[PDB]
């Protein structure tokens, strides 16, 4: 636990996690892309909505 | 200790036996040698090489 280091009174937002990936990651694989995820059938064009 | 029956711990690999000078020429990336029974029968000394 690192609550005394990685927590801020107003909220520490410097740590991020990847959500909405097309497929599961392979072992020891890193994905740092920031492309907009397409959950529905409507294509995205680099914008969120 | 050579030419004597001793317990040996070579780079974490433990065993018992007699160590003698070997004519085998290990490749630079190789550390252990095994026979047809998969037993460690040759070893490179980590210090004297």
């Amino acid at each position: 636990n690192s609550n005394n280091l990685d927590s801020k009174v107003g909220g520490n937002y410097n740590y991020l996690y990847r959500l909405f990936r097309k497929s599961n990651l392979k072992p020891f694989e890193r994905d740092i892309s920031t492309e907009i995820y397409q959950a529905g059938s409507t294509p995205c064009n680099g914008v969120e909505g | 200790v050579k030419n004597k029956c001793v317990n040996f711990n070579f780079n974490g690999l433990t065993g018992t036996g007699v160590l003698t000078e070997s004519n085998k020429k290990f490749l630079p990336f190789q550390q252990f040698g095994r026979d047809i029974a998969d037993t460690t029968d040759a070893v490179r000394d980590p210090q004297t090489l």
């Binding site: 392979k26 072992p27 020891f28 694989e29 890193r30 994905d31 740092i32 892309s33 492309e35 | 085998k24 020429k25 290990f26 490749l27 990336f29 190789q30 550390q31 252990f32 040698g33 095994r34 026979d35 047809i36 040759a42």
Partner: protein, 278 residues
């Protein structure tokens, strides 16, 4: 920076037979006078291997082949190279060769060896280039057109400086370099071997076990790769940096590894001298 080459003659792809090449040491365990059976990603014996040329033969039509296409990286790549003037400069591996995804660059800058996992905006026609000076009668490296921008990365490695003479030797191929590239569990496995050899056109027939070269902790998704070559410029073949170039004679062969069981023979000296594809 980004420059696309022109005046390239269109020719059908070439295919050759890999007889027994592509065998590498499965592990780092010494074995002597044994027959060892192991299941691993191997190049099948007598496999259909793609062949790419780099050659400029003059004439009314001639042939100007400078082959650096983007080839698939399915499960592992056997890359053989027959050359005499060090034409092959390196490779780039990735999924989308642009800034969207991270890519691995293994290049020879004619002074150091650069291995970089970085977000590269690769050119459509990436290459390297040396220049021949009539007064000096020497070849110097002058062009590096692999990528446009590099950003958002982790992996950097620069080798010790060397000379790596760039003279345009003429005659027969005097170097055969074999590489095995694998991408397993976030690790880029590179096995390498070098052979003198002496022949004209095709891949030499024989056996040569590839020894482990490097274990890069890469950790990226790889499905495609492109070979970065070196072109020649001099007082001849004039142009505007897009058509004023000549390609030194070289060939490189690409094959794909599959999960196979191989029976290798370790001689009394611990060298793999023969193999059987079960």
């Amino acid at each position: 920076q980004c420059v696309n080459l022109t005046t390239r003659t269109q020719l059908p792809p070439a295919y050759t037979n890999s007889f027994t090449r592509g065998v590498y040491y499965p592990d780092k365990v010494f074995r002597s006078s044994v027959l060892h059976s192991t299941q691993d990603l191997f190049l099948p014996f007598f496999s259909n291997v793609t062949w790419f040329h780099a050659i400029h033969v003059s004439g009314t039509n001639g042939t100007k082949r400078f082959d650096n296409p983007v080839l698939p990286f399915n499960d592992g790549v056997y890359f053989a190279s027959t050359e005499k003037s060090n034409i092959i400069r390196g490779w780039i591996f990735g999924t989308t060769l642009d800034s969207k995804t991270q890519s691995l660059l293994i290049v020879n800058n004619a002074t150091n060896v650069v291995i970089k996992v970085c977000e590269f905006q690769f050119c459509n026609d990436p290459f390297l280039g040396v220049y021949y000076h009539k007064n000096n009668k020497s070849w110097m490296e002058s062009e590096f057109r692999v990528y446009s921008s590099a950003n958002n990365c982790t992996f950097e490695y620069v080798s010790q400086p060397f000379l790596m003479d760039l003279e345009g030797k003429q005659g027969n191929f005097k170097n055969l370099r074999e590489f095995v590239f694998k991408n397993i569990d976030g690790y880029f496995k590179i096995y390498s071997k070098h052979t003198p050899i002496n022949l004209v056109r095709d891949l030499p027939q024989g056996f040569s076990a590839l020894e482990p070269l490097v274990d890069l902790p890469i950790g990226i998704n790889i499905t495609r790769f492109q070979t970065l070559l070196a072109l020649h410029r001099s007082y001849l073949t004039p142009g505007d940096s897009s058509s004023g170039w000549t390609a030194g004679a070289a060939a490189y062969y690409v094959g794909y590894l599959q999960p196979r069981t191989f029976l290798l023979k370790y001689n009394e000296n611990g060298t793999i001298t023969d193999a059987v594809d079960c």
